[PDB]
Amino acid sequence: LTCVTDITEECAAGQKICFKNWKKMGPKLYDVKRGCTATCPKADDNGCVKCCNTDKCNK
């Protein structure tokens, strides 16, 4: 599996998911984290997460 990082990368043996994670910096302003993972991350109360499992689905 290949996931976006910023740049891209190939995930560890057991990592079959790419993620996007909206972290709030201020009103209307969110820092979006992207990368490989094995378990879909939990979202912040004021955030949102999207998880997918094909090559760089997480553009």
Place this chain on the structure above:
Amino acid sequence: LTCVTDKSFGGVITEECAAGQKICFKNWKKMGPKLYDVKRGCTATCPKADDNGCVKCCNTDKCNK
């Protein structure tokens, strides 16, 4: 059910949903790098997100702050 409908400059508005609208939603629509307008309101079916977005759906009062 009561859901948030708009949020701007510290003030929010809310509303009571119709009989068949049993979910509140948040919808991240992209305006620029790291810049998102979050749409909020009542709905009956949770909407699909834009390819470049994200959606959160909940069903308690003003869950969608």
